[PDB]
């Protein structure tokens, strides 16, 4: 028997789920970003998509280097705030290539911050990155990507209510010539959760008309399914002691039921007034309990 003391703040919540739809969106975005980078840098980059990592937010934060450009982005209409992380190496490579450099010298990063010119270069790159990501998402679910803010430290973002929240991280590796760099795209699981059934199964070559026809027929098929409806006349609170002495012939007082709740497996569906019709216990339906 395994029995160990409960320790809070321990990484005990494990939620592993393959995300095929994200697995293809990543390659589509990588292809779009590669040509965007070719268009900008006038060079030939190769982007390798890494394995999607489903990890608590503080793991993602601690693995990041300091300083690193973080780009808070809004993936409307999905409520939340995603993050696009550009490594110092990648921005160094881009600035070197733009400003008359054939990347001859090795990239040197020693905690140096980002100037206004570097920030503008990163904004120019991030415009292409966001356009590519939006186009890639457009195939499955049309989303609009808005860049709201850029930061350099990790403690300024806090896109997760708690550091133990679970986020989805995709690291890409971009190589230009001999130089290499990496950049990540992190989405909080709260944003993805309404689209889990969409992001879980691999996409199929269908149409929106076919999809809506599918659930329509399924909805119609569901209607022909019998349910069990239970009407509760009264709910009287008695102690255990009363129940054991309880014996036939006793009278347990109850209050006036103005309305009768009808529930299916616990969930209330109807409130209706009791009655007798055709020798049967009947209910006069008064109100369907809408949410």
């Amino acid at each position: 028997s395994d029995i160990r003391p409960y320790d809070p703040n321990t990484q005990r919540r494990v939620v592993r789920e393959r995300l095929q739809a994200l697995e293809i969106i990543n390659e589509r975005f990588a292809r779009q970003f590669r040509m965007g980078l070719f268009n900008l840098l006038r060079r030939s980059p190769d982007i390798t998509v890494g394995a999607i990592r489903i990890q608590p937010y503080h793991e993602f934060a601690r693995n990041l280097p300091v300083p690193t450009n973080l780009n808070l982005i809004h993936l409307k209409p999905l409520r939340g705030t995603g993050l696009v992380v550009f490594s110092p190496s990648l921005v160094f490579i881009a600035v070197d290539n733009l400003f008359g450099g054939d990347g001859r010298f090795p990239t040197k990063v020693e905690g140096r911050e980002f100037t206004h010119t570097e920030q503008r270069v990163i904004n120019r790159m991030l415009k292409l990155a966001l356009e590519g990501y939006s186009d890639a998402w457009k195939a499955i679910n049309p989303l609009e990507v808005e860049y709201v803010r850029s930061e350099m430290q990790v403690k300024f973002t806090n896109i997760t209510t708690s550091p133990n929240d679970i986020v989805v991280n995709t690291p890409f590796h971009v190589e230009i010539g001999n130089l290499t760099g990496e950049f990540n795209i992190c989405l909080p699981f709260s944003m993805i959760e309404p689209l889990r059934e969409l992001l879980v199964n691999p996409p199929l070559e269908n149409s929106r008309h076919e999809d809506q026809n599918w659930r329509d027929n399924l909805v119609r098929q569901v209607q022909h399914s019998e349910l069990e409806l239970v009407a509760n006349f009264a709910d009287i609170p008695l102690r255990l002691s009363q129940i054991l002495k309880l014996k036939p012939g006793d009278v347990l007082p109850i209050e006036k039921p103005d309305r009768i709740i009808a529930h299916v497996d616990g969930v209330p569906v109807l409130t209706s007034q009791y009655g007798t019709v055709n020798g049967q216990y009947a209910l006069r339906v008064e109100h369907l309990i809408n949410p």
Binding site: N217, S225, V277, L288
Partner: protein
């Protein structure tokens, strides 16, 4: 004579929407197979005996909600846990084919 006699409550009937009843638990059940068999072989059955099912091996399995057939799926194994993959909602024609 406490209960009041209700009658003539057949006002009308019209589907409202499928979200008034949404968060109501459904009893989903996947079915491996069927076989029509009489009591003759029924008691002949002992422990370790094998009963052949009418369903051919590898065919799509049946999915029911509260015992009502809605869809046909395919069985898959994910992380050592059994799972069905919904393939197609059945048609009224196959429903009656099933009935006969």
């Amino acid at each position: 004579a406490v209960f009041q006699q209700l009658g003539g409550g057949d006002v009308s009937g019209a589907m409202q929407d499928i979200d008034l009843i949404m968060d109501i638990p459904v009893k989903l059940t996947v079915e491996l197979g069927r076989t029509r068999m009489t009591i003759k072989e029924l008691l002949r059955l002992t422990q370790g005996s094998v009963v052949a099912l009418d369903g051919l091996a590898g065919e799509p399995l049946d999915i029911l909600i509260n015992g009502y057939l809605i869809a046909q799926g395919e069985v898959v194994v994910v992380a050592d846990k059994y799972g069905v993959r919904i393939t197609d909602i059945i048609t009224p024609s196959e429903r009656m084919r099933r009935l006969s």
